[PDB]
């Protein structure tokens, strides 16, 4: 993380599709470097949906500038999250902040 910043690094982190955000609020069921399993809450559970949400994490993919990009998870086993919360730090990301 930068010690001297501005505060708009979180907007750059969550506005570009390079991180993993939570669509519905709930608790984390299974933590892995390849996938993230999050069980949604009762107030946001649809009656016709499939249930839990599974977030796939891209690991060691090639970019257009021959730069290695990957997404590493940051949540722990059994942590309550909400809507709009970050789940995995991608390239140049430190807990939802831009880390150049």
């Amino acid at each position: 993380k930068p010690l001297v910043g501005t505060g708009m690094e979180r907007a750059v982190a969550v506005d570009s599709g390079v991180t993993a955000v939570a669509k519905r609020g709930g608790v984390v069921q299974y933590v892995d470097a390849s996938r993230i399993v999050i069980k949604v809450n009762e107030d946001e559970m649809y009656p016709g949906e499939a249930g839990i949400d599974i977030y796939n994490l891209t690991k060691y993919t090639r970019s257009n500038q021959n730069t290695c990009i990957n997404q590493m998870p940051c949540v722990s086993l059994g942590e309550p999250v909400e809507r709009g919360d970050v789940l995995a730090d991608g390239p140049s990301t430190d807990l939802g902040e831009l880390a150049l």
Partner: protein
Amino acid sequence: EFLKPRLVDIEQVSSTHAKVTLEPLERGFGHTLGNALRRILLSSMPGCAVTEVEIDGVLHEYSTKEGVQEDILEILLNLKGLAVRVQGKDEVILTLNKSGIGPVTAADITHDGDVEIVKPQHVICHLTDENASISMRIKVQRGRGYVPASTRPIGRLLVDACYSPVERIAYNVEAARVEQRTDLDKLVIEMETNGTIDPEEAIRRAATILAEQLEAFVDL
């Protein structure tokens, strides 16, 4: 005439940093001896670090394993800063076995007798699955200085090793409080150590290294 400094006061206030005081010294020799001991203690010092890690579950370091939380490169970076003291061996092979959900600390390594773990709270990885397990072979060598893996099977992973067990050296020249000669000074040296080496033994090793390096001037 000159006087000889002695190591009589060795303070160990914690397990990381210790203060060694040299007494007595002259008016000009204190700063020179302190800077020389600092440069020898920071330039070259023997130690033991993790050289090679062989994991049978993964092929290369850019892969991942189902069950662990951190990546294999993060496991190698956590094993890079591992401190271990070897008594009288050079090539030690360590075995790690852990099953169940929980962190993998430094106490999970099998005991060998000749090795000593100075920090059992050092974590390596985190297991998040019940049936998942990882077994690795850690090769710890004994060397001196910093050397990357670029200068020196497909399952063997190469990692850089730092054989220097000294973090920082701080020294200052303080005047003697009660002394018959006012020109005499004492040198206090504090050194941070991870725990894999002795401060007095490192001071003796720096002294005999400087005495060996100074032996080429008396033949001139």
